[PDB]
């Protein structure tokens, strides 16, 4: 029901050179379970031969055959022997194939859902639930396959032996001891997680008194305390040293129940075995075959107290990922957009972000190809929201959006935004060379075309004054350049794309008045036959526009050219006279 | 040379009920080294008795005497046995006496040095070097006393035995094997710290590409990439999976050198021992006394590879604390200040913060007792700096400061600031009840006097509108109250102190004009016969002052009363006419 999705990540589903390593690393697990009943048997045989005064020529070939199987097979769990850690040297290339196919299945999925970040608030906690869900599937798989199943199949082949070859009372002793050694490890461990979660609470409430009694050394000197903060940092460090005594003297109780159980299963077994040797039913060596075989049989059952938490944690830390992969796209688009001329039309579009307010109410216009449209108005009117719906980040509630007589909701969204190039309002940059931030528009462009269209952005003479040339660094999100040099890169990128429809949220905000008409005249021989939608707060830029739209609260109050709204005396003429003086 | 200061923290220097536990926990370390040569010897004896067909009545009292010493003495290091973890149940009360005397020796030392925070920039890194230097002395002491010295004295009593009682070639084999098992653990471990410090560098440079390609999902949709961030997150996750293969297949080389050394010291020893038994120089049981005694002799030498770093780290993480405790106070004061009337005098005081600029130049005035002095001027003139030197946070360069004809540099600074009560400019509060923030002035005051002098601060009718009464919470640094309710607590605290000299940096800054003269008239029946120094930017408060001082750049330009500077027409009269309109 839940391991049915885990075992799909065991078999790598492809690349059959890694379908062979899985069979070898499950064939050195079967060899390892047949060396825990060879070495002990060999040891008893040596003891018997020594007792029967065997010749030296027939005894040196059964001592070097024993030490070789003590090299082959492991020691304890401290010195792990050659068969194990050869299925660790070969298992690296199988858990470096599950930690690459899983976190390229969600990172290629967070970019395709919607304009809702990642169905989370910050991406600092969505990439945390993503890197933690990849280091859980691999870990969980490893524990069950190599640490839990082998351990619980090394006791069952240690009860059918001592059942076959011994006196059938020994098997019962082993079963009773091992079961107790296990139900008094799981019970007392989850009785101790009560004690440390009330310990990590207090120690951060003790250390939050030493900090804020030194964040203001400024104030403790006026009233001359200087000792009263010592007599109440002692009184909160003694309260903490009575709640770690209950978590360091409750681990001693755990290591006196795990010791008294294995100190009685080795008493009621050894004494019985000695008696049998006396009755000549067994011999010497079968007493040494019991003291050796028990000690290698409970030490793998000792690190099952760690694994009861790290497996229980990795089912709530693993299904957090597997419904993150089941989140609906919602905005999914169908033939490609057939772009011919660039005629943009809205027909009565209504839009709302979160249904409380209508952001755009009955927005309608028509842009003929080769014409520049101007959007003006106050802040928060809905100006950049129109340039979000044309690019289709968001679905509209009603109405229709047409480009060359074709609805944008019908065609594919990957072909809609190939003819549209928009410079953002506040521009972000990648954390690399600026010659790659400019070529990111059309990535197949050469170095001769990047430098050519960076002349049209007006930054070309500003980069040659820099050291290191075009491949200097911007830092993260372009913060090492400027406010204005950051922005002229974003105009430059759009020109390398050379889109059919050009959109400009903000282009002159951080630039002075001498640098707009160096670009606006340069964009005018770029926007000669290509559709342009511009919106600016400064009002001298949109004088030579073709049609000016005024937006107050998401509703168009008046439209027309520049001279038709100055003689009208509406809200545009009052906005023009307010800026002239 | 450096363990001479470590062994002083072993002996607790007092409380002789914890000078007895140190002798018991060093007497269960001598019992534990004499159970590693009792249990193996007992085991050989049992084997010999079985061979010689001993009677059952004389064999059951040497098997239950063996299992009892396997309960008493430990198992491996996984199931630690009763003698150990009885010097862990008793050692808690000795390392809870060193983790309380050390971090009350530095926390009572950071409040006594100077007005330089803590000779650091932020207290978030001075309390980090302080809590880390306390969890180092205890840890280091434990490792050497209980983990390193016992281990290296359990091999030397395993060479003088096999030297005495065996055939004098065995001792050499043990010495050769153990030494190699140790110089091929220290060498290969510090050959592997090269490989992981170049692994933690790359993994944070891989994970800083997934974050900033999702901090702006805003920008990657315009140029329609959505796959180009996948084809360069794969190309930087394969660069990382070639630098953890060199750190997970160089640990396999460590566990094939620690295995081949102990797989040859148990070959060249066991074969020789078997030969001796054949020559009837030894017997059966002396072959089992060698296979048992080696395996318990290298497993304590296995966790010496962890302890070579955690001890080397704790000498650079420990002497960072022991010159932090050797930092000079510098400003140390001598009889107590004899306060009679409260006559404050400066005689040509000069002062500089960092020797580049003279902050105060030839400041001189005289305040008769029972009079209010006013300081005015622009921002950054040196107004609050005068109220720092009178309280003596800082030593002056030249000149003299006198209170009632007594220099403040001569008397003790703990008696100087008992007659002076200053409200700070921006007021900070403790993170508890507001009835404790008000009683922190005089801590021995009762609840009837806190509520009485909170009436004089004007907050008394504002707290009874709150829920929970006087013991409501302010949060950390008073941010839960207000800007103005935060400040009226700081006036209130000063009144409970009732000092001889009252200082007011800012008292009306966050209060409106209706709440100053509710306090200023209320302070006027508090400041009736007690010296007051006030400084305010609003100029209506200091009209009825006794003497007004004007400070431009740390130099007094003009002084006198209110009417004597309006008729003078100086810089005070131009500052008065600028505020009237």
Numbering used by the authors:
A (entry chain B), B (entry chain A): 244 to 576, 580 to 827
Copy text from the publication.
ABCB6 is a “half-transporter” that contains a single pair of TMD and NBD, but needs to form a homodimer to be functional. ABCB6 is a porphyrin transporter located in the outer membrane of mitochondria that may regulate the heme biosynthetic pathway together with the plasma membrane porphyrin transporter ABCG216,17.
We solved the apo-state cryo-EM structure of human hABCB6 in nanodiscs at the resolution of 3.6 Å according to the Fourier shell correlation (FSC) 0.143 criterion. The overall structure shows an elongated shape with 130 Å in height and the two NBDs, like two “legs”, are separated by a distance of 35 Å. In the apo-state, hABCB6 adopts an inward-facing conformation and TMDs of hABCB6 contain the substrate-binding cavity which is divided into two parts: a closed cavity 2 and an open-form cavity 1, different from the consecutive substrate-binding pocket found in most ABC transporters. The TMD region of hABCB6 contains a loop “plug”, just like a gate, which includes a sequence of “GGGTGSTG” in the middle region of TMD. The distance between those two “plugs” is about 6 Å and it is impassable for the substrates such as porphyrin. In the apo-state, the “plug” in TMD not only plays a role as a barrier to forbid the entry of substrates to cavity 2, but also maintains interactions with the neighboring monomer.
